[PDB]
Ligand binder design. Structure first.
Ligand SMILES: O=C(COc1ccc(Cl)cc1)N[C@H]1CC[C@H](NC(=O)COc2ccc(Cl)cc2)CC1
Lengths: 318, 318
């Protein structure tokens, strides 16, 4: 009853104010648990009313934070699960609900295996004495690299992300496992690119065009890789896949307080200058060489088929 | 008298039949000595008659072997020296001859210094733990690399030249000095190019367009370097500079017996198949990053000015 309502609220405000939970895998787990509790703790008999209330609460979620697309695309995954179950039972009400629940359960148990799947897949993409470059921080990519390091020796060049220098803690984490790690400013990306073999980077969201929304500055790294023709690898699980297209959407970049870019102590100039701090940026699919997912490697030119396999095309608007 | 005639002949037939001397630096030395002996052992009073007989014998030389452009372009150098001396003394007959002789002497003493000059210049182009790739055999390039190796550690990938696998002896010579050397077939150029930092190659002739005539297969290596945007360096002394342009000329490629490509023992198919063995090939200037010479480094877009500095424009046809 009101527990469900206040938990939905709590989650909405946690998504709105700050980043909670930090890992987007934990965010997917939390939103899936909440969707399960909603579909269990409501008086819905027909699948249509359930889908409608799910779409409404998902609209509220998406309005809470548009840049966090995992919640929305997993809501769409739940909607596709409901559609599949209704087609199975109609192409049956209690069995409907329990079958939806076991579908969500299998989705959740395969959710925690994507990390291990990518880690296992990592070995056949790294050779000895290779030079990797990565930008920012990504749990999936550091797991990739520290799993490849157990049987291979290679160098990782971590380009810090300004202003949020998450790349520093990533470099430290990689050095923990003895992965020879060079830390540099993002300004030195093109200067060092000539000596890099591969580029491995995570992402926040993959669009239907194949493009991906990743931390700012990664588009420049992709342009450098394309200039030097080095393969650019994206190790992104299959819950960051978003059916929306690049310019049919709104609110792509996430702008945070310019205090991160230019501090308050600069004084009077802060009334004359316009400071901008875009967290995310757009990378076209032409600059991506290969996508690594929990199922296996795939070219950017197959992400649309993955969409068709994951999301109903009438649910791309929620 | 007849000594000069028979020596000129001997040289013509040596150039016509085979490669003598082997090193084109020694070829430049020999042709300069012969030009000196001609200008000394003829009864010429006016500079015009001397220039005319020089042009005639140079035409005979060029007809002996068109692919060997060092002889012709150094004949043009001697003609430019004669023009400069005549302009100095006219803008004076015995002094004319002795001044031409001392000009040839300074040209010759600076001729043997180009090797050492490039070797000295080599250090500021190689950094530690760098991956060089080269194709075929080139005395200048191996001197470059073994001089850089005295103070730096780096890897050299030598692509053998089919059919004349001169790259094997180059790899052996480089390994003599402890330069970690990988030997491969030319077929693996693009496969390995992704892990190469620089490409350093010699040449047989540099054209006025900036393009260069080098051993077959080097155009593919240059295309691979351009694809991967790796800098391509050409360590060529300033006596391989030819004022002729790419397609205003004749007889660019040198075709040798196809026995080198397909052996006689193949039998009847040798009457039905057409075999071709081009020794040289054309590399456009767009694929060269930097030229290294005895004077210093220069972009391909300055070779025309070097021409203006070396050859009179009315002597480009001999
Ligand atoms: O030591 C490093 C560290 O590299 C960087 C560290 C930091 C920065 Cl800022 C940039 C680069 N990288 C190695 C990577 C292998 C390479 N080459 C070799 O070991 C040999 O390479 C070959 C050998 C044979 C073939 Cl067929 C191809 C390449 C030496 C340098």
């Amino acid at each position: 009853g009101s527990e469900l309502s206040e938990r939905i609220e709590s989650f909405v405000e946690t998504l709105k104010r700050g980043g909670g939970p930090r890992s987007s895998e934990e965010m997917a787990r939390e939103t899936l648990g909440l969707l399960r509790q909603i579909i269990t703790d409501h008086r819905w008999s027909n699948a249509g009313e359930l889908m409608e209330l799910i779409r409404r609460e998902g609209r509220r979620m998406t309005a809470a934070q548009p840049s966090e697309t995992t919640v929305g695309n997993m809501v769409r995954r739940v909607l596709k699960i409901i559609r599949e179950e209704y087609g199975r039972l109609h192409g049956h009400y209690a069995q409907l609900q329990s079958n939806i629940i076991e579908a969500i359960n299998e989705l959740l148990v395969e959710l925690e295996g994507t990390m291990e799947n990518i880690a296992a897949q990592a070995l056949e993409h790294i050779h000895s004495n290779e030079v990797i470059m990565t930008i920012g921080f990504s749990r999936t990519v550091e797991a990739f690299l520290k799993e490849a390091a157990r049987k291979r020796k290679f160098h990782v060049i971590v380009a810090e992300c300004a202003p949020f220098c998450q790349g520093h803690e990533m470099a430290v984490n990689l050095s923990k496992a003895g992965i020879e790690t060079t830390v540099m400013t993002d300004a030195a990306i093109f200067a060092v690119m000539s000596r890099v073999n591969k580029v491995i980077i995570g992402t926040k969201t993959i669009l239907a065009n194949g493009a991906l929304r990743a931390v700012t500055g990664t588009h420049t790294l992709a342009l450098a890789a394309k200039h030097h023709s080095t393969p650019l690898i994206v190790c992104a699980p299959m819950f960051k896949l978003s059916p929306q297209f690049p310019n049919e959407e709104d609110s792509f970049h996430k702008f945070v307080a310019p205090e991160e870019v230019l501090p308050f102590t600069e004084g009077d100039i802060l009334e004359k200058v316009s400071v901008h701090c875009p967290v995310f940026d757009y990378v076209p699919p032409e600059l991506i060489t290969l996508f690594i997912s929990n199922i296996g490697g795939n070219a950017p030119s197959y992400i649309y088929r993955l969409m068709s396999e994951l999301y109903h095309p009438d649910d791309h608007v929620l």
